[PDB]
Amino acid sequence: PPPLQAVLVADSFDRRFFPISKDQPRVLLPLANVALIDYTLEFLTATGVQETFVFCCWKAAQIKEHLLKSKWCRPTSLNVVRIITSELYRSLGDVLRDVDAKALVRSDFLLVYGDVISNINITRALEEHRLRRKLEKNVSVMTMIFKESSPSHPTRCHEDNVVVAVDSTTNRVLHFQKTQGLRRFAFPLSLFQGSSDGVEVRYDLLDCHISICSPQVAQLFTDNFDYQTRDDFVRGLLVNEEILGNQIHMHVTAKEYGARVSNLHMYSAVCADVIRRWVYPLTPEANFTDSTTQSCTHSRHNIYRGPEVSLGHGSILEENVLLGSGTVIGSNCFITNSVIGPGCHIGDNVVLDQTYLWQGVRVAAGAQIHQSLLCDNAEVKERVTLKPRSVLTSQVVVGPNITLPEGSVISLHPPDAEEDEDDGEFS
Amino acid sequence: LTTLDVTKLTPLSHEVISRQATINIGTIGHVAHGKSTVVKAISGVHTVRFKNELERNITIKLGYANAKIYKLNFKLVRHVSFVDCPGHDILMATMLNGAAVMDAALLLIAGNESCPQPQTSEHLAAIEIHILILQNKIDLVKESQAKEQYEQILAFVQGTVAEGAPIIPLKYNIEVVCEYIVKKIPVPPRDFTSEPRLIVIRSFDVNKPGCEVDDLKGGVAGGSILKGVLKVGQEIEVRPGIVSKDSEGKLMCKPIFSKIVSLFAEHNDLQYAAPGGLIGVGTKIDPTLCRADRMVGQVLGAVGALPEIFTELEISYFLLRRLLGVRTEGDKKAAKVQKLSKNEVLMVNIGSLSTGGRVSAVKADLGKIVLTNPVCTEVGEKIALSRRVEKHWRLIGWGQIRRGVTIKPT
Amino acid sequence: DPSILDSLDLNEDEREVLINNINRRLTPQAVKIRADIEVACYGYEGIDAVKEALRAGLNCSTENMPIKINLIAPPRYVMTTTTLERTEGLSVLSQAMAVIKEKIEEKRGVFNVQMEPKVV
């Protein structure tokens, strides 16, 4: 068989990150001081992929510049990465149509998005897919990867919850639907006529958004030019079964981790999982993207400390705290369950709970920050309290003596932000 | 055994020079992909087996079936190619986008039921336009047959608004239908003196795996020729060509030039190709550019056809209010074509050129459709507009091209 | 050449047995050099240029070493030749590949080496 290939869509064709994504692509957002593209590239490289194609449209220049300076673009990298840009891209269907047009792939490639955090090794799934393809003579066209989970887990967001009806003895997907806003699920009877021996209905599957595909997938995408998403392909293929059977199978992992960052809820959940070493060996102290800046040491209670952190006197780091290089922390501080980017400056008697601070964040003394996100070079003045689910975009300052509500999203762009932001808090 | 030669100047539709296929006759009926048995009983079962691959568009590709009618130790009198695609919507969209397609029709009606399929067939026949209805409800009692004939006559009384005055009634019925077709089918006027033009509907790669470097044949295309006659050895060009966007700019299309090294019908065809059939013009093209159905959607010109490459087209349309002839028991807004929503993918079908297009802008009288791939059809031709409602592309309206974006790369 | 073994004065049956053992033990001369090349031209005479390049590459085959070039995929061909002395076989395959690449590039086409020559 030829070397394993992978198509890495480096642009989510949906805007779930305004106004954050208005000056930085979602693919380049730092999760744990490391961009998502680095995580997905490491996942692809570690599983044996030898050739990768990145399709980036929105702000492709920044993605190209970041990739060219990364580890995977070195001559010594075994995962050769090809960068293809186009302003005409509008959906994943367009990307697959372009792949079929230029004939990038030859057999059994990988389809993943550019914001997938995982440590899954797909050797067994790939072998099963290849054996099934050989035995059935080109009937199984896709093998989607799912993770055993529970409906109550923080990673199971309401938006991306999926219920799948499958054939338990061959791992064949018979029905697939999303449960967004549905209090009751329905399944057609045509499932039970064929595989009456065994049918299972599974709601405990977390969609890692990883698929092992065949060039027939791109051929079907270019045949049905209206297809835009993977879900559209799955639904249209499962409903059109009497002709062009082209069945889809699946693989379930239990001891491996995989999930894609789709919104702030998923971002926070995956960041918490990564800090707590749930994606081992992709840990903050592993430095899987070798760089002088992102080196740190691991201590008790999952405390990661970088070089020259210079913690103050009386400040307490409770647990699950990552501190970037060059950060400065004041006295009598209390930081817990938080990720702080490099170069941050923190005042005295602050409280940080489940917050995320990116590069250059400056916080004045006496601040109270809970469950909020602070983007690059954000600033907070004296005695400011940020209620949960607050977002401060880049170059945003908040004036003194103000308590932002529990949904405050402010940026320098007036329309997209719920409140236009400047050196002041009100007006 | 035929004796086709390479000496002809002004052939005719009924001329015995070709005697393979000159007139294309459609076949739309309520058989629901059951017309294959009738076609085989009228033409032959294994008549078409010359090039096979992995099928791509089963329900969106028009299929032909060559057949020669013999009469009076028998002599062939006429040869007609029967066209029958899965789903009358595709055939209706293709036929009603110009002319020179499906010159005749055969309504495969049923004497058992008068379900909505006959109504849809009648609507498609009216929209597309010399029809010849025929009932295949064999194995029925004499009184039952008379009642079915009375019901069919009652339906044809209403259907005769456009064309509803045919008459037909196991192999005896096939012979009667063949005689009626031979007697009634008229010769259509085809412009043989025009420059040849072929539209590709099927591409193949004849080079088998593990072949030697000597028996390496390639470029075996296919399709249909509308206007003109194709001669072997002529210098042909592909209007679409190879389209690439790797230049970090707009899409660039480079036409592909070749020479007609062969011309094969279902049987062995001569060096000259005539309109009205499925003629595979195998040129000297590399098989890598022409794999299984990888060249479909290109026009094989001869003298550099004036039709330029179009990326986007401004089409004035008249969207049909409801589904043509589809009135189900429920009809819960299913048979209701909505307005042209922005950023919606529609199946633009210019003649036999099936392509895809998304709506970019529209102001109450004309849409600006950006196509998924460049096409070379015309500057003012009639372009149909289709859209699927439930896993089935169906006609939505018409269109007239007024302006477009031209790509002219060397 | 069993002439040297003829000078032995052991016996006739002994000489025959020794010759048979020597020829059956120390005569494993068999080696195959295989390579894969993707060459195609999108020109006026595309298939013709591809066939000409393939013929030019195959013409470089020496005695007792016929390069049986075959088409693996529509865009890719495979060169296989069961010739002993693999050290010379690799050089012969490399020379044939270089000649084929030069012929393809001269005919305004494209050529690439998917896999370099290697043993079976």
Burial of B80 (0-12, 13-18, 19+ CB in 10 A): buried
Which residues partner with C77 through β-bridges?
C37, C71
Burial of B73 (0-12, 13-18, 19+ CB in 10 A): exposed
Largest CA distance in chain A: 72
Burial of C59 (0-12, 13-18, 19+ CB in 10 A): exposed
φ, ψ of residue A238 in degrees (nearest 5):
-75, -30
The count of other CB atoms within 10 Å of the CB of residue B100 is: 19
C-alpha B326/C-alpha B395 separation (Å) is 12
Report chain breaks in chain C, C–N > 2.5 Å, as residues after which they occur: none
Taking the alpha carbons of B348, B349, B350, B353 in that order, is the dihedral positive or negative? positive
End-to-end CA distance of chain C: 29
Torsion of CA C90, C94, C100, C101, to 10 degrees: 150
Q: Which residues contact B18 (CB under 8 A, 6 or more apart)?
A: B4, B11, B79, B272, B274
Amino acid at A4: L
* CA-based nearest residue to C30, from C67, C65, C78, C77: C65
Q: For residue B357, what are its two tokens?
A: 């297009």
* CA-based nearest residue to A340, from A117, A36, A32, A17: A32
C-alpha B230/C-alpha B278 separation (Å) is 13
Q: Topology of A5-264 in CATH?
A: Spore Coat Polysaccharide Biosynthesis Protein SpsA; Chain A (3.90.550)
* Look-up of token digits 């030039």: B257
Chain centroid offset of residue A87 CA:
23
Which residues partner with A321 through β-bridges?
A303
Measured in angstroms, the CA of A174 and the nearest CA of chain B are apart by 17
C-alpha C112/C-alpha C110 separation (Å) is 7
Q: Does A225 touch chain B (CB under 8 A)?
A: yes
Which residues partner with A51 through β-bridges?
A5, A80
SS3 C97: helix
Q: For residue C60, what are its two tokens?
A: 């470089």
Which chain C residues have a beta carbon less than 8 Å from that of B284?
44-48
Q: b/e for A38-61, b at 16 or more Cβ within 10 A? A: bbbbbbbbbbbbebbbbbbbbbbe
C-alpha B176/C-alpha B171 separation (Å) is 9
Chains interfacing with B (3 or more CB pairs < 8 Å): A, C
Which residues partner with B392 through β-bridges?
none
Residues in chain C: 120
**Strand-strand pairing, B309-316 and B367-375:** antiparallel
φ, ψ of residue B301 in degrees (nearest 5):
-80, 175
Burial of C89 (0-12, 13-18, 19+ CB in 10 A): buried
C-alpha A347/C-alpha B193 separation (Å) is 89
φ, ψ of residue A146 in degrees (nearest 5):
-125, 155
Contact C71 B291 (CB under 8 A): no
Which of B51, B207, B213 would best serve as a mutation to test chain C binding (most C beta carbons within 10 A)?
Answer: B213
Q: Which residues contact B233 (CB under 8 A, 6 or more apart)?
A: B259, B260, B261, B271
Q: b/e for A380-406, b at 16 or more Cβ within 10 A? A: bbeebbbbebbbbbbbbbbeeebebee
Contact B248 A85 (CB under 8 A): yes
> Computed over its alpha carbons, how large is the radius of gyration of chain B?
22
Which chain A residues have a beta carbon less than 8 Å from that of B252?
none
Q: Topology of C33-119 in CATH?
A: Alpha-Beta Plaits (3.30.70)
Which chain A residues have a beta carbon less than 8 Å from that of B60?
223
C-alpha B64/C-alpha B83 separation (Å) is 4
Which residues partner with C80 through β-bridges?
C34, C68
Number of H helices and E strands in chain B, helices first, is 5, 20
Contact B216 C44 (CB under 8 A): no
The count of other CB atoms within 10 Å of the CB of residue B130 is: 13
End-to-end CA distance of chain B: 45
Measured in angstroms, the CA of B29 and the nearest CA of chain C are apart by 40
Cα dist from B310 to A204, B97, B240, whole Å: 49, 18, 10
User: Given in angstroms, what resolution was this structure solved at?
Assistant: 2.8
CB A52 within 8 A of CB A44: yes
SS3 B87: coil
C-alpha A350/C-alpha A346 separation (Å) is 8
C-alpha B179/C-alpha A188 separation (Å) is 49
Torsion of CA B28, B32, B33, B39, to 10 degrees: -50
C-alpha A252/C-alpha A208 separation (Å) is 10
Q: Categorise residue B134: left if φ over 0, alpha if ψ from -120 to 50, beta otherwise.
A: beta
CB A175 within 8 A of CB A188: yes
Q: Which residues contact B36 (CB under 8 A, 6 or more apart)?
A: B84
C-alpha B240/C-alpha B294 separation (Å) is 12
SS3 B268: coil
C-alpha C67/C-alpha C93 separation (Å) is 8
C-alpha A50/C-alpha A79 separation (Å) is 4
Helix (H) or strand (E) segment spanning residue B149: helix B142-159
End-to-end CA distance of chain A: 64
CB A283 within 8 A of CB A298: yes
C-alpha A81/C-alpha A84 separation (Å) is 10
Experimental method: cryo-EM
3-state secondary structure string across chain A: CCCCEEEEECCCCCCCCCCHHHCCCHHHCECCCCEHHHHHHHHHHHCCCCEEEEEECCCHHHHHHHHHCCHHHCCCCCCEEEEEECCCCCCHHHHHHHHHHHCCCCCCEEEEECCEEECCCCHHHHHHHHHHHHHHCCCCCEEEEEEECCCCCCCCCCCCCEEEEEECCCCEEEEEEECCCCCCCCCCCHHHHHCCCCCEEECCEEEEEEEEECHHHHHHHHHCCCCCCHHHHHHHHHHCCCCCCCCEEEEEECCCCEEECCCHHHHHHHHHHHHCCCCCCCCHHHCCCCCCCCCCEEECCCEEECCCCCCCCCCEECCCEEECCCCECCCCCEEECCEECCCCEECCCCEEECCEECCCCEECCCCEEECCEECCCCEECCCEEECCCCEECCCCEECCCEEECCCCEEECCCCCCCEECCCCCCC
Q: Write out residues 122-141 of A within 8 Å (CB-CB) of B.
A: 138
Please list the alpha-helical segments (H only) found in chain C: 3-6, 12-25, 46-59, 86-106
CB A234 within 8 A of CB A131: no
Burial of A178 (0-12, 13-18, 19+ CB in 10 A): middle
Which chain B residues have a beta carbon less than 8 Å from that of C108?
none
C-alpha A366/C-alpha A351 separation (Å) is 8
C-alpha A88/C-alpha B247 separation (Å) is 13
Cis peptide before C2 (omega within 30 of 0): no
SS3 C82: strand
SS3 B36: helix
Amino acid at A316: I
SS3 B173: helix
> Computed over its alpha carbons, how large is the radius of gyration of chain C?
21
* Look-up of token digits 């079936």: B65
Which of C37, C47, C52 would best serve as a mutation to test chain B binding (most B beta carbons within 10 A)?
Answer: C47
Residues in chain B: 410
